[PDB]
Amino acid sequence: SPEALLKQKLDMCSKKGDVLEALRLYDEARRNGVQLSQYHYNVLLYVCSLAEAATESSPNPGLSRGFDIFKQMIVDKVVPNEATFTNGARLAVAKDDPEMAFDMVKQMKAFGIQPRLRSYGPALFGFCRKGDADKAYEVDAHMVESEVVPEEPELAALLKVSMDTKNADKVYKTLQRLRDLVRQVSKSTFDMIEEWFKSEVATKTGVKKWDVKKIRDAVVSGGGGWHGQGWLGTGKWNVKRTEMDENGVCKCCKEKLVCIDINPVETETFAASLTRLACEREVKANFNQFQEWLERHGPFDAVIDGANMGLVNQRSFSFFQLNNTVQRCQQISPSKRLPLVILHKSRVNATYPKNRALLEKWKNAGALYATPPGSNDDWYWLYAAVSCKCLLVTNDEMRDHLFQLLGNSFFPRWKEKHQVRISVTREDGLKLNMPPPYSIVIQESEDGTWHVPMSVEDDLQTSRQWLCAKRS
Template sequence: MTCRCLLQSRPPLRARSLYFYVRSSTAFKIVLYPHKTLVSDQLLACGAGAVGRLLHSRAPHASSSSTLWLREAATASATPKNLRGSHNLPQKRARKKPVAVAMGPEKRSVSEAGAGSAVSAQPQQQQQPRKKQRKSSSPDALLTAEVRQAAKHNDPLAGLAAYDKAKAEGLELNISAMETLLYLCSGGRSWDTQIANSSAPAISAATAAEALPVTEATHSADRPMSEGSVEGSSQAVQACDHQPSSANGTDPMTDSTSKQDARKADHSTSLSSEAWADIAQRGRAIWQEHEQRGSANTEVAYTALGRLEAMAGRPEGALEAAKRSLAAGHQAKLRSFIPALKSFCAEGDFLQAFEVQSLILEHDLDLTEEEYALLIGVCAHGAPWAQARAVLGSMSRELTGLQESTLAAVQRYFRSAAAKEALGVGQSEWVVEQCTVSEDGRPSCCTGQLQAMDLSEEEYEAFGRGVAALAAQRERKPRDFEAFVSFLGRNGPYGAVVDGANAALFGQNWEEGGFSFAQIQAVVGQLRCERPALKPLVVLHQSRLKAGPANEPTAAAFLDKLRRQKQLYSAPFGSNDDWYWLYAAVQAGPTALLASCDEMRDHVFQLLRPKYFRKWKQRHQVYYKFKANGTALLTYPAPFTVCMQHLSDSGAWLFPAAQSDRWLCAMPR
């Protein structure tokens, strides 16, 4: 076997590693360990019938002999040209037992071998990777695995089959398996469909056919989707509301495996309503058996019980399950009340539905758009105008753009007999139609002007406390964020906060792009020109201030000026600078602006209460882009807020669509 060195001559270094190309397409490495210094001067060829220039020692150590080791390094390319040096071969490989290259009866250094000696070695055969031995699982663990596998496919029959098999073998469900099985029996991922099919037709009648095609219009390119989307709301509630409660740390109601396997076959869709009724009955029997044994029930189990009661058409039982969960000392969660709320709304019982809403608000839980759609929909069953108006007012404060299903519920209410109670003298009906809104906030369907809706003073304080609490909780060193709060107290308030990293990286995803301090300077300069009364603050991570671009003369001068003016803050290592610029902008109050093109959709911002965050973002975020000459073009918030509003001039109610520029207008006539 012939080997040929692919490295050029190198200077003498201790522990030099040389790579060789072997005709068998296997690369080997000669490792000259630190206890001996062997130096390569020239290329080496070695093998049967080949005599090459050998390594010789320039600085031998005390020992007169050294050992040359040969061990496998990587699989090489078929042609040596593809390997231009040692850096092309993997540096981290599994450790293998080194094989000594025999040099005679005794181990001799290469320098002793002489120029005419030949070195030959047979590489060690590759060791076969050891197969991992399967750990023997207990019957209980196998049962849990089968039930969880059934949950991945949303297959309640498979879960019940595993349960029956366990009972036949004398096994009992552990807490995790019991929760997952109850989750399956209560509908699993499709429980909304099951409650709609098993209850009165009030919910299932909410079809898009009744609604005006508000979302058929062209999507707006100027309004970010996050401003009108309810996804941030539901995800934010899930982040704070859904926490693992099982013994193994998983939650079948929100387990990530369910989301990952949502694309797999959903076996529940092939089941009839009669089959689901039998499955729900089995689920209640399993619950009773578990309760008779005196086992502790978790919040997840109580939520599943509430779903089972709702599927059976017993909303009072669903509400009782939520109350029992609270009485057992479990943390109040929105999902515990949803089965009762949906069931009461499905039956058109607005009195009980608003009782559930009161319980939710008593525990400081935020309703999402889905719950508001249920409440405004149930108002069509004879609720007084005062209650309907209260729901509309809450929607105006806490929601922005509305989904099509919510707009359909709004239309059903304003077309109902109950809505006529709000009509004045000489008015006979509500006219519900589509409309557009001009750039200055004037609707095409009626007279009036949309207003800019911002947070109240109390809401600003609550929002600021929430941001600070989350930041301190997630910082490695909470004192770092406390130091920033002190900095703002000494030098603030800052009316224009700049997300430095976002500005510097905007449009830089090209070959010669990089971190541009010139773009930060352009944004700051334009803010000073157009909003001279607002004191700017640039927030950057400390790593950005120590990198190469920050040392360029222009950038260094710009940063020094900001430091002298107390208009630069560097988030320390281990901190997330997002919390810093967000808190600074919120703390500055109603007149502050945040210059950033970050849509703030990631998990960090989903932890914030959406009823504060989305409306604040819409009123205070400034977007930018850059001209060819480097000048920044700033886009300020619109003069009105994209949210549901009531126009006193015409008495009309306007509802924005989340996925288009269209609005829904309900106007008395």
């Protein structure tokens, strides 16, 4: 067919890197009357984005036509898919015209298409480089109306543009957004927040009289750990890099941070999403069978990721480390409940006979579920800990794609409250590291003192740095 030739020839044009040939083949198809489908359009947008814009004379027809091709795709009502948005975005990034990036997003919306987060990036980061705060806030308002949630890079851009234009109101609001959506901040956002609090504008914003009643009312109302009523106090901020002790006490100022509740209704929603997500990947009958088993067992104070407890920091599966963990979890259980061990059936059948007999004893005591061949254990230990409302014992770093499906609002908060990690020393052996008695999140106290935590990969490996910003 003629459409299958365009497909065949554009495939090679990208793989060569010839944009001029892809643009010739584009026009030939219009002069031949051949309709372009999803696939054809995506390859052109990608191919066009291999071009750069000229430092000397007007930009090259690869990028210029790229946007025209995109505009035409939308006009034609060719359905965009995830490769469309990626390509249109990398076209916008190479072009580096924030104004034109923002047009694509406006077209998408005009034609009933839901823009992606990566669509907004070129516009937002361009306007930020340029210092055009008003345009950045336009892009932001457009995301909000499109219900596309920013992540940390977009929020940091918004923060920095707000700092650049002395807009203390936007700094405040953006800081609350970081609290709400990100919780702990990257190193570059952390440095940026420190600069804000040390700056003249920050020194010069505030109020020395305020209604203590309305603040306290706002603290109750927000769920705790913030009030949202604006900057309080006056004068220079004391801004110190510091740490929290194990009880959430700031080492600089002695403020004890608060522990923020989780709403049990959000937990039930999450439980249902786990079930849905798991059923999509596991054999449905396997996950059902586990849920039915779980309904007939328990109660549990803890759930163990048995593969991770056998393997973390080991050359091969350590039954010693699994068993030591089981024993320690049982010892801290107020009634000495055995923890529920989730482990692959292949690993249940350990080749030292007393260990195999113990694994079978645990099963017989209602405290071991052997997951079937082909299963991903993670769904099982997550579903169990969530549903049994108990501790989850795993050092899984949660780098896997699976965990990205769980979202970045509820699940990180839940994890903080439920996750136990093991650590081992030469001197002392194995230790359980329990959930902290405070929430590791940006906090704003009732007198307007701020504590801002840095994000780290593992906070047992890394001593987590915090900012303490307190009026002098």
